[PDB]
Design a binder for these strands. Structure first.
Ligand SMILES: [Mg+2]
Ligand SMILES: [Mg+2]
Length: 132
RNA sequence: UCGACA
DNA sequence: ATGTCG
């Protein structure tokens, strides 16, 4: 049932909106494959979205067909739509995350991928392996 | 009016 | 508490 041969991604924050980071781990081993430097202001869902898209890019650049697990129904939908429907205000503090989101959407519109993006089933399996 | 995912 | 979708 759990596809162990996969990349798991999650967001961590302090505040929401607040300081946002995300990371990607090997679901089997728990090895940390990428971790993004904290972004001073963002939302949980923005970070969950950026983590997926970072994973797609990471896997694509490495010619890997592994799926990606996320526990975020929001982010999964945003990635599918190629569109992050965040409510976060736009100002000088949120400019960085909003630039990163814009660039993520732009990646999705300029690349193909066959990577299945799967929902991690927290209720049945416990916390996703990339959890902070 | 909630339900659900975080 | 907030950020999001069904
Ligand atoms: Mg999560
Ligand atoms: Mg989590």
């Amino acid at each position: 049932e759990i596809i162990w041969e996969s990349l798991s991604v999650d967001v961590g924050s302090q505040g929401n909106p607040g300081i946002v980071e995300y990371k990607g781990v090997d679901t089997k081993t728990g090895e940390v494959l990428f971790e993004r430097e904290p972004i001073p202001i963002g939302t949980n869902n923005m970070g969950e979205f950026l983590a997926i898209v970072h994973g797609l890019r990471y896997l694509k650049e490495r010619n890997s067909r592994k799926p990606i697990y996320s526990n975020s129904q929001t982010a999964i939908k945003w990635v599918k739509d190629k569109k992050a429907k965040s409510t976060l205000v736009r100002n000088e503090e949120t400019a960085l995350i909003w630039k990163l989101v814009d660039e993520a959407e732009e990646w999705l519109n300029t690349h193909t991928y066959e990577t299945p993006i799967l929902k991690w089933q927290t209720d049945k399996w416990g916390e996703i392996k990339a959890d902070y």
